[PDB]
């Protein structure tokens, strides 16, 4: 628009994996309506 100088608007998926992927995905990729035991054992110790 004549006053802003260009900046990086978009990037490709592989470019995005380069920057963020080191160390991969943190998370378990939770799903709706899944039976999961995750967190249960901690909750029991917190209770005890």
């Amino acid at each position: 628009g004549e006053d802003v100088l260009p900046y990086e608007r978009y990037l490709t998926p592989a470019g995005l994996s380069l920057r963020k992927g080191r160390f991969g995905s943190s998370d378990v990729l939770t799903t709706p309506g899944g039976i999961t035991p995750r967190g249960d054992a901690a909750r029991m110790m917190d209770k005890i």
Binding site: P13, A14, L16, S17, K20, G21, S25, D27, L29, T30, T31, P32, G33, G34, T36
Partner: protein, 161 residues
């Protein structure tokens, strides 16, 4: 993209053949189906916001996804997910009018898996959402339209999975 009319034309053009009665019959077949399709498309456009709402309620929301640590947690992610849902709906509507699945391949399906994997978006949940939208859409459009609508939704689902 391609549509049924253009598909016939393209097949003839590679042959170099002038349009013939057999070709005309295929075109005629599409023209009869067309009126139904247009009605279905108008229904979907008017109810688009609700369709997304209902589908999300059925699968996405009130779930671990929305809870902290879930992919759809935070406002930004929630908004992104519903935006994606809208895309799928709009493209399926386009495909239904066209009568061809090609547009889905050229715009939606191409590189989606890779994008999602980098993002960490869960594909199976997304597929679930698409299936939910299909069910809601089926009701609104009515039975004759539903069959046509369902194939495009299923095509998207199969591509993602």
């Amino acid at each position: 993209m391609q549509d049924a009319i253009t598909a016939v034309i393209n097949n003839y053009d590679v042959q170099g053949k002038y349009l013939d009665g057999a070709a005309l019959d295929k075109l005629k077949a599409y023209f009869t189906t067309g009126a139904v399709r247009v009605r279905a498309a108008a229904v979907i456009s008017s109810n688009a916001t609700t369709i997304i709402k209902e589908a999300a309620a059925k699968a996405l929301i009130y779930s671990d996804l929305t809870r902290p640590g879930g992919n759809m947690y935070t406002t930004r992610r929630y908004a992104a997910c519903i935006r994606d849902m809208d895309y799928f709906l709009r493209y399926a509507t386009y495909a239904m009018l066209a009568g061809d699945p090609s547009i889905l391949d050229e715009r939606v399906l191409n590189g989606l898996k890779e994008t999602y994997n980098s993002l960490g978006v869960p594909i199976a949940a997304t597929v679930g959402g698409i299936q939910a939208m299909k069910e809601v859409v089926g009701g609104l459009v009515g039975p004759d339209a539903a069959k046509e609508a369902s194939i495009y939704f299923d095509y998207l689902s199969s591509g993602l999975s």
